[PDB]
């Protein structure tokens, strides 16, 4: 499938707010060859890109749900196909992107022809990166309700589910001494994130 020419031009419209000279975090949930949640975050401006994708490898998705994102696969059946490839194509040229663990972000961008994107690796330890975790969830819990399952960590203690958006927000908080003052606003309209079908009309 893919996005129509009108959607691609609308996506091109929404991508203009991103300041290409501002700090931009990027995190994904799921493997880079088969991602299911993608998030970009500019803390200075408050603009964030957030959308989902149906997985190709169902066997690996179940493992990632048990030990990371805890997403029910049935909640990803109405996503817009091809949005990931289109958003990556529409990112500004030679944009610099910040991430905790730059390996998987680099693989996703190179697999989509965007070798021009510069990446900076913030190497924070596992428990250091998620110090603001409870504070980020309490402030922006209404921005993602997709994480419904119980996530555990092998040696089987239950943990908070990993969200691509909340990760970008809490990672920037760890290197900035706290949450940014800017209020978040979504770059992408909801009609492009979820392929919504016409419901039955009550006559």
Binding site for Zn ion (CB under 5 A): 144, 146, 163
> Residue 163, annotated ligand binder?
yes
Q: Output 47 or 144, the one with its CB closest to Zn ion.
A: 144
What Cα–Cα distance (Å) separates residue 82 from each residue in 89, 95, 98? 11, 21, 24
Longest pairwise C-alpha distance within the chain? 58
Round to whole Å and give the CA distance between 189 and 196: 12
In the chain, what is the straight-line distance between the N-terminal and C-terminal CA atoms, in Å?
A: 33
Neighbouring residues of 152: CB distance < 8 A, sequence distance ≥ 6: 66, 67, 158, 159
Comparing CA positions, the residue from 148, 102, 91, 156 lying closest to residue 124 is 102
* Shortest CB 164 distance to Zn ion, Å: 6
> Residue 153, annotated ligand binder?
no
Q: Output 19 or 186, the one with its CB closest to Zn ion.
A: 186
* Shortest CB 118 distance to Zn ion, Å: 26
Q: Output 28 or 146, the one with its CB closest to Zn ion.
A: 146
* Shortest CB 141 distance to Zn ion, Å: 10
* Shortest CB 201 distance to Zn ion, Å: 32
* Shortest CB 33 distance to Zn ion, Å: 20
76 in Cβ contact with 55 (< 8 Å): yes
Give ∠ CA 16-181-37 in degrees, rounded to 5.
Answer: 55
> Residue 47, annotated ligand binder?
no
Q: Output 2 or 149, the one with its CB closest to Zn ion.
A: 149
Comparing CA positions, the residue from 118, 100, 126 lying closest to residue 39 is 100
Q: Output 166 or 177, the one with its CB closest to Zn ion.
A: 166
Binding-site residues, in ranges, read 27, 29, 37, 144, 147, 163, 167
Which residue ranges make up the annotated binding site for Mn(2+)?
A: 27, 29, 167
Annotated binding site for Zn(2+): 37, 144, 147, 163
């Amino acid at each position: 499938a893919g996005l129509t020419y009108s959607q691609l031009m609308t996506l091109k419209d929404a991508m203009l707010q991103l300041d290409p000279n501002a700090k931009t975090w990027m995190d994904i949930e799921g493997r880079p060859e088969d991602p299911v949640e993608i998030a970009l975050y500019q803390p200075s401006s408050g603009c964030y890109i957030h959308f989902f994708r149906e997985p190709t490898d169902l066997k690996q998705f179940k493992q990632d749900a048990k030990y990371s994102h805890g997403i029910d696969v049935t909640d990803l059946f109405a996503t817009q196909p091809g949005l990931t490839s289109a958003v990556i194509d529409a990112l500004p040229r030679n944009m610099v992107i910040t991430c905790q663990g730059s390996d998987d972000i680099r693989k996703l961008l190179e697999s989509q022809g965007r070798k021009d994107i510069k990446l900076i690796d913030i190497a924070l330890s596992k428990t250091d990166s998620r110090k603001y975790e409870n504070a980020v969830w309490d402030q922006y819990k209404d921005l993602c309700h997709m994480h419904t399952g119980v996530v555990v960590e092998k040696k089987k203690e239950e943990i908070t589910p990993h969200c691509a958006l909340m990760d970008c927000i809490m990672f920037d908080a760890a290197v900035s001494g706290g949450l940014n003052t800017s209020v978040l606003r979504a770059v992408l309209p909801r009609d492009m994130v979820f392929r919504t079908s016409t419901p039955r009309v009550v006559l």
